[PDB]
A paper describes a structure:
Since [name] is part of the highly conserved nucleotide pyrophosphatase/phosphodiesterase (NPP) protein family, we investigated the evolutionary conservation of the analogous histidine residue and its requirement for [name] degradation. Two zinc ions are required for NPP’s catalytic activity, with Zn1 being particularly important for stabilizing the leaving group, whereas Zn2 activates the threonine nucleophile. We found that Xac NPP not only degrades cyclic dinucleotides but also prefers 2′-5′–linked over 3′-5′–linked cyclic dinucleotides. Furthermore, the conserved histidine is required for degrading the 2′-5′ but not 3′-5′ phosphodiester linkage.
Residue numbers in the entry: 44 to 426
Write the structure that this text describes.
């Protein structure tokens, strides 16, 4: 039988957290296999746009998942907890790896992965779940274990897994916190038990592993939250999203009015017309992107006024969603298996390239994507 692919995301694991003695199992995974120095997220450096980049090889700007939170005249609103929008296929552009795996008559098993609850291009994974917070570490790890072990023509060629606990630890206390490091150990620990259980099940040697994060993490010092209204007053323009990438739409007759006040630079943020965003971000053309886009500077948030008053008064926190070239925003990429190289290190690379690699490990044709196949050929054992 051909070798299965286990794709693991650790949400918000930053590229340098592999080097702090707090990741015994993942460090050993890199000893055994391949570790990129870092992997750069796409713009914007949030969960849904990047997870869905990884699995399609497309920039957010082309796949259409352009924020965690979006509107679309035709399809309506979109946010992470809006289950009828997340599980609605018209939002999700291109073809993610599980669709491609299914269409060759092999099988995909998704614990969680953004897009995996929708029938994208008419196709849903062979195994899947609705997303629920609080699901126990052991719970998700034993179904993944099961889903690799299953045999015959109901064998799973792709198993995906997702961990939200680091990102969540990095929001409430920041990336240098005791909590963050502890959450990193807790997930690393759970990856240990997975790998160990795979061995006892005799699936370890049969299975190729890729471990990624969707972005890094930046420290937000206490009191560094302003209001999105400190950027643009309501009667001018509406804040479409808050956090760090703050979209604005002009009120029907303030189109010009809005441009003065918002555009250009300010103490803790900058704003551009969407078609003039920094060219290096490759973002601005998808229709769904609101008309002005403000990027908060590293370590500052802009929040909805009602979200401003509930904010943790005191407390060092964290965010991401910042300039995806920033070193704080760098993600992880490691990989190990029978079909991957041993001992090796790769340079820093763009997260659009992961797809071509995965498409080769899943015996599927790579759909047209924004990445370059050459970047990750050196991860392989073969040519
Ligand atoms: Zn994330
Ligand atoms: Zn997050």
């Amino acid at each position: 039988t051909p070798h299965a692919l286990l794709l693991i995301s650790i949400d918000g694991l930053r590229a340098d957290m592999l080097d702090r003695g707090i990741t015994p199992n993942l460090s050993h995974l890199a000893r055994e296999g391949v570790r990129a120095r870092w992997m750069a997220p796409s713009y914007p450096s949030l969960a849904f746009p990047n997870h869905y980049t990884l699995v399609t090889g497309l920039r957010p700007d082309h796949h259409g998942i352009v924020h965690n939170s979006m509107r679309d005249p035709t399809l309506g609103g979109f946010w992470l907890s809006k289950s009828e929008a997340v599980g609605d296929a018209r939002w999700w552009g291109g073809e993610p790896v599980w669709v491609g795996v299914e269409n060759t008559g092999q099988h995909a098993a998704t614990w969680s992965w953004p897009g995996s609850e929708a029938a994208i291009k008419g196709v849903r994974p062979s195994q899947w779940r609705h997303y629920q917070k609080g699901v126990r570490l052991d719970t998700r790890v034993d179904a993944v274990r099961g889903w690799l072990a299953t045999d015959g023509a109901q064998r799973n060629r792709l198993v995906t897994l997702y961990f939200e606990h680091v990102d969540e630890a990095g929001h409430d206390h920041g990336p240098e916190s005791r909590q963050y490091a502890d959450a990193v150990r807790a997930v690393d620990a759970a990856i240990g038990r997975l790998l160990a259980g795979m061995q006892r099940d005799g699936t370890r040697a049969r299975t190729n592993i890729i471990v990624v994060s969707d972005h890094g993490m930046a420290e937000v010092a206490p009191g560094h939250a302003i209001s999105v209204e400190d950027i643009a007053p309501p009667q001018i323009a509406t804040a479409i999203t808050d956090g760090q990438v703050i979209g604005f739409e002009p009120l029907p007759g303030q189109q010009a009015a809005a441009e003065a006040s918002v555009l250009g630079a300010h103490d803790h943020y900058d704003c551009w017309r969407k078609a003039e965003l920094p060219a290096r971000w490759q973002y601005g053309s998808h229709p769904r992107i609101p008309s002005l886009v403000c990027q908060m500077h590293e370590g500052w948030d802009a929040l909805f006024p009602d979200k401003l008053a509930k904010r943790a008064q005191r407390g060092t926190r964290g965010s991401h969603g910042y300039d995806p070239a920033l070193p704080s925003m760098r993600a992880v990429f490691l990989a190990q298996g029978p079909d991957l190289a041993q001992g090796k290190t790769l340079p820093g690379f763009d997260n659009v390239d992961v797809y071509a690699l995965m498409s080769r490990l899943l015996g599927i044709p790579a759909a047209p994507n924004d990445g370059n196949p050459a970047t990750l050929l050196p991860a392989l054992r073969m040519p």
